[PDB]
Design a protein around this ligand. Structure first.
Ligand SMILES: COc1cccc(SC(C)C)c1NC(=O)N1CCC[C@H](C(N)=O)C1
Ligand SMILES: [Zn+2]
Length: 139
């Protein structure tokens, strides 16, 4: 679990969005596994606007942060789950690092701010949904 709170927006994994997220929907994209809902309170986070390919992510299944080198946002095949059919997920960045089901939503940060959130994983891999191209989050 986990979310980004920036301005009057809450960014979550689309597959973990709540009834309240859908009732206050701003934007969603199943191909990216992202959903953004509106909030009444001002957020605590800021978003990176950069091309960093290294950073640090929070891994809830270890209660720890780990450093990672990750690929540029791209279209990657993701196997069927209870949440989605087999498909290509876009704007996804892969890295070597621990992740399990439950780790989705953990934040990836570089020196410039929030880069994205955990969205997929596998046998020693962790994948992140990028948010750096969503310029409207800042206004
Ligand atoms: C952090 O997520 C994981 C980590 C290790 C393993 C796993 S599936 C295990 C059966 C190999 C997963 N789960 C996932 O990759 N997803 C299930 C939830 C939806 C995700 C999506 N964006 O489509 C895909
Ligand atoms: Zn950066």
């Amino acid at each position: 679990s986990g979310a980004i709170y920036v301005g009057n927006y809450r960014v979550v994994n689309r597959h973990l969005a709540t009834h309240n997220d859908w009732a206050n929907l701003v934007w969603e994209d199943s191909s990216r596994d992202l959903l953004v809902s509106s909030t009444t309170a001002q957020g605590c986070d800021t978003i990176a606007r950069c091309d960093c390919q290294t950073g640090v992510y929070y891994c809830s299944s270890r209660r720890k942060h780990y450093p990672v080198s990750f690929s540029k946002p791209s279209l990657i095949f993701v196997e069927a789950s209870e949440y989605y059919p087999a498909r290509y997920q876009s704007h996804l960045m892969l890295a070597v690092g621990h992740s399990e089901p439950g780790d989705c939503g953990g934040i990836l940060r570089c020196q410039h701010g929030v880069v994205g959130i955990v969205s997929t994983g596998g046998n020693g891999l962790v994948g992140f949904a990028d948010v750096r191209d969503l310029l409207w989050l800042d206004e």
